Write a protein that binds this ligand. Structure first.
Ligand SMILES: Nc1nc2c(ncn2[C@@H]2O[C@H](COP(=O)(O)OP(=O)(O)O)[C@@H](O)[C@H]2O)c(=O)[nH]1
Ligand SMILES: [Mg+2]
Lengths: 297, 379
């Protein structure tokens, strides 16, 4: 039933955000970029400093405190790794609809325990950890992405990489297509959102006419994305999909991994109708010409 | 992070896991063993002069085989085709094996946490039976909250083929391995073969443990054991300033923020005929001392004939990044060219700061442009 929280991925101008780790260096910086971008940031939390004001916004000690006062519906986490998993738990307790954890370096065991509880509920949706965040171009920015390269458009972007996502964003704007919703699911093995979750939203979003998927070598995420598309994106109103897999030129202990891709990830995506761009600088042109091949311009 | 066998065996012994009695040496000359086991010590599997592991009955022979191992490379199925230079060897009290079994405990994404993975047909090349007979592989998904239950340990030990008094003995070792797996913040604890001696002792003869890097802040003693000898000196020195270095065979060094972006940088350099020498991921945090050090390491390697700086979305204003490169380059007098691609907050100003400095700095507009400029400057 955790899939019921997928819808909370689609932030908008009405989303009310709070920052966990508000007074922290990273929390202050990105909280300021968020305000300048127009994001409805209504405060944040740092233990021991509740009540005072920070960046002209109220500071709280707990997440439930900030939520009851500001009616926040989304939370962004910049807490250090040793306490980030607990920061996620605190938000799930408060039943924050959307939680975006930017922090990198959370122990896998910690996230395994968090994800154990996350899957037994459907009120909170987690993005990350170790992700750039989510952004509705022009309406809401919850993350670390540079806002100036985005622009509300027609291409839904999902990326397992960090900075590499910005190349797909910058290119879709220069070609005049823009982005409808950009999501970075992060690069950790145990996370709250995967490729299929974002694809489900893109395929059912009218504003999303094209889709770009950013991947890379390692794991099975790209393959699972292919199988999902081959079933639900092949047929009547098939939306065009483009992808790039980093590490084509990357170089390659135990028997566990072999028991339980690069070349194969590409072959799998193509089988589901995905046009894979071999160059990281041709994501915008490829999706553009695909729109041209479908009279979608 | 991965440790040698002798380092994992000691860790397992301290937590009640039955292991062999071992010694480590650096030379062939360097127990009362009825039979001795000689095993090359490398951070790789498939070690089995031909063969990385040998069995003899008394010392003398070990001194003759240890000369053909130490100092030589050992190429296995999971090592680079060149192999891995063998520096240490293990001499341990060899025990007889009635049965070879495979057992592993790992965090698997599909299993949403820990999972026991075993096969009664273990030893040597477990991966064969995995593909051949998928039915010989068994899986017990463990609940991180409830922990490993006695029933699960018994069922796995039963499917691994431990019968009679050995079943409860193996199940107890499985429990101690799972608890160890959690204690040391491991991503993989693999024992192959999970053996069975004729005396009726369940023993872990070999051990391969992968440690979660993210848990180092609470695994100080464990990460202090990392020899770091199997890494290039350039990598270890890069890590001192929180810079992850990865060397390649080329002439164009890369300085990028983001592993995914760095791989794409190497990917697009190939597309234009160039070969990247290295690639130094700067990560999220961007201390203007790192950029200073970054060039020092990238320039140290003689094969570097050009440095490509591709920074997109840095946390710090690109202007501050522009000033760190100019002085860092000026203080050391860079010889090789420098192609710089910056993007982020206040970049229109940041770029002129580069070219209006009188320094050998060529600015790039995008990624495709930066690549072609890099391959062109190495003529
Ligand atoms: N009898 C016996 N065989 C051993 C011993 N240690 C390793 N072997 C054998 O070594 C072979 C490969 O096992 P191992 O060295 O642990 O793993 P590797 O990394 O693939 O070399 C198997 O055929 C084992 O039976 C031992 O102490 N006694
Ligand atoms: Mg083995």
């Amino acid at each position: 039933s955790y899939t019921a929280s997928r819808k909370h991925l689609y932030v908008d101008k009405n989303t009310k955000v709070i920052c966990q780790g508000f007074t922290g260096k990273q929390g202050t910086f990105h909280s300021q970029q968020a305000l300048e971008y127009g994001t409805n940031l209504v405060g944040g939390t740092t233990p021991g400093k509740g009540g005072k004001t920070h960046l002209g916004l109220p500071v709280f000690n707990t997440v439930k405190e900030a939520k009851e006062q500001t009616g926040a519906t989304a939370s962004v986490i910049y807490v250090p790794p040793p306490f980030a998993a607990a920061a996620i738990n605190e938000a799930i307790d408060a039943e924050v609809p959307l939680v975006v954890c930017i922090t990198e370096g959370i122990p896998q065991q910690d996230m395994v325990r968090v994800k154990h509880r996350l899957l037994r509920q459907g009120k909170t949706r987690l993005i990350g950890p170790n992700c750039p965040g989510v952004i509705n171009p022009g309406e809401c920015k919850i993350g670390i992405m540079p806002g100036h390269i985005h622009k509300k458009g027609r291409i839904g972007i999902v990326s397992r990489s960090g900075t590499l996502t910005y190349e797909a964003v910058h290119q879709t704007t220069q070609v005049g297509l823009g982005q409808s919703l950009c999501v970075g699911i992060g690069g950790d093995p145990f996370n709250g959102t995967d490729f299929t979750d974002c694809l489900e939203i893109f395929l059912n979003d009218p504003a999303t006419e094209g889709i770009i998927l950013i991947g890379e070598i390692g794991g099975n995420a790209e393959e699972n994305a292919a199988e999902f598309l081959k079933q639900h994106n092949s047929g009547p109103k098939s939306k065009p999909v483009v992808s790039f897999i980093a590490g084509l030129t990357a170089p390659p202990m135990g028997h566990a991994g072999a028991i339980i891709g690069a070349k194969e990830k590409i072959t799998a995506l193509q089988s589901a109708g995905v046009v894979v761009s071999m160059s990281p600088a041709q994501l915008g042109t490829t999706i553009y010409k695909e729109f041209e091949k479908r009279k979608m311009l | 992070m991965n440790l040698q066998e002798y380092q994992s065996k000691k860790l397992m012994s301290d937590n009640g896991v039955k292991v062999q009695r071992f010694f480590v040496a650096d030379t062939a000359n360097e127990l009362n063993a009825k039979e001795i086991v000689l095993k090359a010590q490398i951070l790789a599997g498939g070690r089995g002069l031909k063969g990385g592991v040998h069995l003899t009955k008394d010392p003398e022979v070990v001194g003759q085989l240890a000369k053909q191992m130490i100092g030589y490379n050992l190429a296995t199925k999971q090592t680079p085709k060149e192999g891995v230079k063998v520096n240490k060897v293990m001499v341990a009290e060899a025990l007889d094996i009635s049965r070879e079994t495979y057992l592993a405990i790992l965090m698997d994404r599909s299993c949403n946490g820990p999972v026991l993975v075993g096969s009664p047909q273990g030893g040597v090349d477990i991966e064969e039976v995995a593909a051949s007979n998928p039915e010989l592989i068994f899986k017990e998904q463990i609940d991180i909250i409830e922990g490993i239950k006695d029933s699960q340990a018994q069922r796995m030990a039963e499917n691994l083929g431990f019968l009679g008094p050995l079943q409860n003995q193996a199940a107890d070792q499985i429990k101690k391995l799972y608890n160890l797996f959690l204690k040391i913040d491991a991503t993989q604890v693999e024992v192959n073969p999970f053996g069975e001696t004729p005396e009726g002792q369940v023993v872990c003869f070999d051990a391969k443990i992968n440690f979660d890097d993210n848990a180092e802040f609470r695994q100080k003693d464990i990460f202090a054991m990392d020899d770091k000898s199997e890494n290039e000196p350039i990598e270890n020195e890069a890590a001192k300033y929180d810079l992850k270095y990865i060397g390649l065979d080329g002439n164009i060094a890369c300085f990028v923020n983001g592993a995914g972006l760095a791989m794409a940088t190497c990917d697009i350099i190939f597309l234009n005929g160039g070969k990247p020498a290295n690639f130094l991921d700067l990560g999220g945090g961007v201390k203007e001392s790192q950029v200073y050090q970054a060039f020092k390491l990238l320039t140290a390697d003689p094969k570097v004939e050009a440095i490509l700086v591709n920074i997109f979305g840095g946390i710090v204003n690109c202007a501050i990044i522009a000033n760190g490169i100019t002085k860092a380059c000026r203080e050391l007098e860079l010889k090789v060219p420098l192609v710089v691609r910056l993007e982020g907050t206040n970049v229109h100003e940041a770029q002129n700061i580069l070219t209006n400095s009188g320094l050998p700095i060529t600015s790039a507009v995008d990624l495709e442009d930066a690549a072609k400029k890099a391959v062109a400057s190495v003529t």
